[PDB]
Write a protein that binds this ligand. Structure first.
Ligand code: HEM
Ligand code: HEM
Lengths: 368, 368
């Protein structure tokens, strides 16, 4: 035994905080596994605003109610014969989001806040249309992949009649069980420390960065206190990346691989003109800031021997126009050193509304 | 702290047994994650026996030597900037196998033992050709997915010039960190306890089941004391499976979901005529026996909304003709109750030779 050992087990052992706002899956410790699932209203229902809106109401209610249960109970408490029987709670958490395309389907474009405007095209884009967008999102996280997939099955089933999967991707980070130091910042498939410059969660900057400011227009206020998720599936050119020596890799980002220190320094907590962290800095983007909570993905190999692995990148912010968008535009247009080694292949924006007492998620938007 | 807690951490904390025979990745405790990678000799080299055989020698030597290092060191000890830096050893283990197609490429059909004859077609087959076969195999296992993918990168890179990935699949089981009882038999995506009837590893039946008996012909003796791996990618029809009530599910297999006891009993440690365990029993197959060491897989959803998830099934045996083959033939032809809910979509047979002092894996076969 040891303190560190107890600490290595905590993420697997504990339930998540079901009260975190706007919803679970943003603040608090990040579980090791994630499944991001984009869904559309079922084809037939989607054809007409009225059936579209009924199916959305059903989907969103079922999910809300099941996310409630899954935060206090495990999948195997909810149903007999689940894959997760005999397992600890593993920080299971569920987040539900709404795409701008949902508003189109239900004829509610009047309800679309400016912050939910489609993402612009970026000059480095290499997006696959089937990996873009979606009427809804489920983000499901857990510290154990079996607990994860059991919860996914129940959540997809709860809205099976009303929705269809559009795209999905599983991701991972180091397990707390295998971290020499389970409080250390996790690394990505490029070997880099990933997360250092996020605003600290015990600091007012966190909530300010994440939280949608009140809407001027009551038709847009269903997103007050919510957050916006930009998800990007970013393939890493690892074979080419591995040809670089360590110094060169460090120059691409502007931080060292060993410690995560900016270049020329000793601690995590000179920089090339085209370095990622220089071009991405709020400083270089009129104060644009986001909270990044991304996962690695490993999908083996594709045609013609291309490595299908990467960063399932996820940025949270109050308004994409003062977060992800200006920053990505700087990285795209100003020639981030990193562009060479990455390809943006999937993209989506989801509005993630604040949970409210006595109402299902997005009930305001649906109404009733 | 507690004994169970220390036990939950052990798989992440320890190195694997590098001395287990024929190779690592068969006996001992099974790590939570696996990556099964089938590779072919590179296209140009493969065209002619002489360059084929040179590239095979290179591939097999590099892999052997790197598997050696990876059993005593972690990927981040082998190279700077690895994705696994700062992580515990996580039971990393590497297994190398050889397909019968390799023997064709190197013009060594004389060397093909009878046990390495291609698997027959089965009546329930639904195999995708790109997911079948392969000249080589790498099986890489670890308790942490980040440790896993770091080791994979180094192993694929070590033979990059000489080989190309043909197909691959990642799988998982419950993590030891999240098991209420980390010694309990792991479950599958159908909720079932999976592994009960395997021969016990502290029992002579284990080695007898696994181990290739000596070859009559010295040209075939390179597999003496080795083992044969049948891998099948088996998709589960989970949506249809979940329509059944618990009793009905239990009738398909012949064991209970809660405890894994045969039907009508209390302990893991009446049965329908078409029950899986009845038709699969050595009893129903002239004593045919295998060691099953499979993993779940979750690949999200495919066209047209089909759930791409399943069992990455792996059977080890001394000779497929007295193991996997007769048993699968009984399940296929005698109408296993389970057939309804599964589809065999990928298949391969690999010869996994015994490690020998002072020689690389399969050096006998290559010679020199
Ligand atoms: C595969 C793609 C990417 C990789 C590998 C990557 C990697 C990194 C690394 C290693 C850091 C430094 C450590 C840290 O502060 O977290 C970092 C920082 C950052 N990244 Fe990325 N990143 C990627 C894509 C993006 C994208 C698409 C955006 C935004 C559009 C973004 C925005 C940022 C920001 C804002 C910082 C912090 C800069 C600062 O204030 O110092 N990154 N990234
Ligand atoms: C998705 C496919 C499959 C599933 C879900 C499945 C599931 C199970 C389960 C739950 C058991 C009982 C627990 C145990 O003893 O391990 C079992 C036993 C067994 N399975 Fe499978 N199985 C599958 C495919 C296969 C295949 C393809 C083979 C061989 C060709 C096979 C051979 C066996 C054998 C030999 C036993 C032990 C029977 C005994 O002696 O009692 N299984 N399987």
């Amino acid at each position: 035994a040891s303190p560190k050992a107890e600490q290595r087990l905590r993420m697997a052992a504990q339930r998540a905080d079901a009260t975190a706002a706007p919803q679970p899956g943003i603040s608090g410790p990040a579980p090791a596994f994630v499944h991001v699932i984009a869904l559309d209203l079922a084809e037939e229902a989607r054809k007409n605003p009225d059936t579209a809106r009924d199916s959305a109401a059903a989907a969103l209610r079922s999910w809300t109610e099941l996310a409630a249960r899954l935060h206090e109970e495990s999948p195997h408490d909810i149903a007999e014969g689940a894959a997760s029987a005999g397992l600890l709670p593993a920080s299971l958490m569920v987040t539900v989001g709404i795409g701008g395309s949902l508003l189109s389907a239900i004829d509610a474009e009047d309800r679309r806040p400016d912050a939910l405007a489609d993402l612009p095209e970026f000059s480095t884009d290499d997006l696959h249309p089937r990996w873009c967008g979606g009427d809804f999102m489920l983000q499901v996280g857990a510290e154990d992949p079996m607990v994860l997939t059991a919860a996914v099955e129940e959540l997809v089933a709860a809205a099976a009649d009303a929705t269809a999967v559009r795209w999905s991707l599983r991701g991972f980070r180091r397990t707390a069980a295998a971290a020499r130091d389970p409080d250390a910042t996790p690394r990505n498939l490029m070997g880099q420390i990933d997360g250092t410059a996020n605003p600290a969660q015990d600091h007012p900057l966190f909530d300010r960065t994440i939280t949608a400011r009140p809407a001027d227009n009551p038709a847009h206020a269903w997103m007050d206190g919510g957050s916006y998720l930009v998800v990007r599936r970013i393939r890493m050119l690892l074979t080419e990346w591995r040809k670089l020596d360590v110094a060169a890799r460090e120059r691409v980002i502007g931080r060292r691989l060993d410690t995560g220190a900016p270049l020329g320094s000793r601690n995590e907590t000179l920089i090339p003109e085209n370095a990622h962290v220089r071009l991405a800095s709020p400083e270089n983007n009129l104060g644009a800031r986001m909270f990044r909570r991304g996962y690695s993905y490993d999908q083996g190999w594709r045609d013609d021997g291309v490595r299908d692995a990467g960063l399932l990148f996820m940025a949270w912010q109050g308004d994409p126009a003062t977060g992800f968008i200006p920053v990505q535009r700087s990285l795209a247009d100003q020639g981030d050193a990193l562009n060479r080694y990455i390809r943006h292949e999937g993209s989506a924006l989801f509005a993630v509304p604040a949970a409210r007492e006595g109402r299902y998620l997005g009930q305001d938007l649906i109404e009733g």
